[PDB]
Amino acid sequence: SWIYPTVILCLFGFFSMMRPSEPFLIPYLSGPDKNLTSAEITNEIFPVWTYSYLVLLLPVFVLTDYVRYKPVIILQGISFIITWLLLLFGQGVKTMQVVEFFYGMVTAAEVAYYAYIYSVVSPEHYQRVSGYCRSVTLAAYTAGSVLAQLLVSLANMSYFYLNVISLASVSVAFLFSLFLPMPKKSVFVQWFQDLKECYSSKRLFYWSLWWAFATAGFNQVLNYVQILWDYKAPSQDSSIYNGAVEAIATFGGAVAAFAVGYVKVNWDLLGELALVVFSVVNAGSLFLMHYTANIWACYAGYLIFKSSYMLLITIAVFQIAVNLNVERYALVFGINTFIALVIQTIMTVIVVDQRGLNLPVSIQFLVYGSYFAVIAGIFLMRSMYIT
Numbered sequence: 001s002w003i004y005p006t007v008i009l010c011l012f013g014f015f016s017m018m019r020p021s022e023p024f025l026i027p028y029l030s031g032p033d034k035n036l037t038s039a040e041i042t043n044e045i046f047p048v049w050t051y052s053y054l055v056l057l058l059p060v061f062v063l064t065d066y067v068r069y070k071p072v073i074i075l076q077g078i079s080f081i082i083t084w085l086l087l088l089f090g091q092g093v094k095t096m097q098v099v100e101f102f103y104g105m106v107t108a109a110e111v112a113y114y115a116y117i118y119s120v121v122s123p124e125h126y127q128r129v130s131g132y133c134r135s136v137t138l139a140a141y142t143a144g145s146v147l148a149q150l151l152v153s154l155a156n157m158s159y160f161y162l163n164v165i166s167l168a169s170v171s172v173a174f175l176f177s178l179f180l181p182m183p184k185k186s187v188f189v190q191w192f193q194d195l196k197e198c199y200s201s202k203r204l205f206y207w208s209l210w211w212a213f214a215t216a217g218f219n220q221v222l223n224y225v226q227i228l229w230d231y232k233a234p235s236q237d238s239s240i241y242n243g244a245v246e247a248i249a250t251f252g253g254a255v256a257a258f259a260v261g262y263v264k265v266n267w268d269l270l271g272e273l274a275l276v277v278f279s280v281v282n283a284g285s286l287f288l289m290h291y292t293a294n295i296w297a298c299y300a301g302y303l304i305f306k307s308s309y310m311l312l313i314t315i316a317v318f319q320i321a322v323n324l325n326v327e328r329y330a331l332v333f334g335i336n337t338f339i340a341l342v343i344q345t346i347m348t349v350i351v352v353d354q355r356g357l358n359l360p361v362s363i364q365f366l367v368y369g370s371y372f373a374v375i376a377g378i379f380l381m382r383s384m385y386i387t
Contacts, residue, residue: 061334131261
């Protein structure tokens with residue numbers, strides 16, 4: 001039944017996201033292995049990832065549905081191999097840019113990885129499956145992180161081997177993705193109006209609009225929570241205590257995602273209530289991080305924020321899948337991801353870039369909490385307006 005494709009896809013997503021080198025990516029390509037200055041990693045290497053993410057998300061949400069979601073996943077596996085192979089044996093900024101390009105391809109195809117399982121299972125299993133899928137990915141990171149940390153705090157193991165373990169991990173994911181069952185079958189301006197027929201559910205727009213905006217803020221919170229912690233703790237407080245909390249935080253998210261998969265809840269009526277409650281929870285957690293000058297309170301707030309958001313995004317993906325009534329699973333997920341990435345890029349340009357506002361970290365998280373509070377209030381207003 002649903003078990004075979006779900007188990008294979010969950011194993012692929014576990015072994016493709018169990019990446020021990022990700023927590024120590026910055027030390028890896030800034031230490032003695034590459035000898036790359038920190039200026040070149042954030043101004044010439046990292047933005048290539050976002051650019052490639054945009055220009056490779058376009059083909060994904062345009063082409064994934066027609067190719068029936070497996071070739072994009074397979075392309076994701078073969079882009080994992082190229083990315084980590086070039087990270088292993090790459091020198092200089094030029095090949096790091098190619099690494100970032102292939103990583104952008106990897107994430108653009110992660111969109112198709114998320115859509116694939118809905119393309120193959122019956123709508124009756126769209127809920128359970130949903131959580132499970134997200135769950136393994138989140139859990140994968142935790143495992144990788146903890147493994148990496150153990151492999152640094154129990155074996156004195158260098159980052160090169162750690163990265164080759166990451167490559168071996170994603171190589172196994174490619175072989176698992178080879179075994180995925182193939183989903184069954186089924187001017188340019190006309191295509192656009194088809195998009196209109198795709199969003200006519202009038203319940204998907206609500207969930208997609210939350211997705212387009214809440215993940216745009218969530219990724220920025222994810223990127224800058226490390227800097228927030230490093231700013232709210234000048235005494236000791238090394239990466240071990242941070243990169244570690246990051247793992248446990250996402251572990252909670254994994255549980256939350258799996259919770260959506262495992263509890264029998266009729267999300268048709270409780271979807272909007274869950275959205276408003278957990279969005280105000282997201283806002284309260286973000287304000288908890290900024291306001292309190294206690295790193296334990298900020299850690300708890302980040303755990304709450306990641307857990308709440310992971311549960312909410314699992315509910316969003318599930319409710320978009322069931323209420324889609326068209327085959328365009330990757331079109332909606334891909335468009336939602338691309339719009340969120342565009343919003344994230346624009347708002348990080350205006351708020352935190354040296355040219356937009358150069359807004360310092362503490363009031364930057366104040367801004368992020370206010371943004372999530374605005375999102376919560378917008379959806380809270382709808383419940384009042386439908387009552």
